[PDB]
Design a protein around this ligand. Structure first.
Ligand code: 5GU
Length: 113
């Protein structure tokens, strides 16, 4: 029960803040199937921030949970694919932690709308 434009403005700002936590930019674009050709063998729905931006502008995120779901997919795919002792796995743990705080604050703002 809110206006669309300010909500999407909020989601754009939030997506920017999540990308800011991915300082290595390892989640900015789809996992390169050229360098990881077996990636799709158990990752049923790849996700990344560029795809999220396209989903956002295509009006596919009309509530906070659908936006947060795809962010969680970025995290969960990375934990699933990579061994625990890798930089990638620890980066997803850190993104889960730092992104979670970004998301909680953003959701508080959406709920005021
Ligand atoms: O799981 C991942 C996350 N992103 C990524 C970027 C480049 C390369 Br190479 C591998 C990965 N794997």
């Amino acid at each position: 029960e809110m206006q669309l434009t300010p909500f999407l403005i909020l989601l754009r700002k939030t997506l920017e803040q999540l990308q800011e936590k991915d300082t290595g930019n390892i989640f900015s674009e789809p996992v390169p199937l050229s360098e990881v050709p077996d990636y799709l063998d158990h990752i049923k729905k790849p996700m990344d921030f560029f795809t999220m931006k396209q989903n956002l502008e295509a009006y596919r995120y009309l509530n906070f949970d659908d936006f947060e779901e795809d962010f969680n997919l970025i995290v969960s795919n990375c934990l699933k694919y990579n061994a625990k002792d890798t930089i990638f796995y620890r980066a997803a743990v850190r993104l889960r932690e730092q992104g979670g705080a970004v998301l909680r604050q953003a959701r508080r703002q959406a709920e005021k709308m």
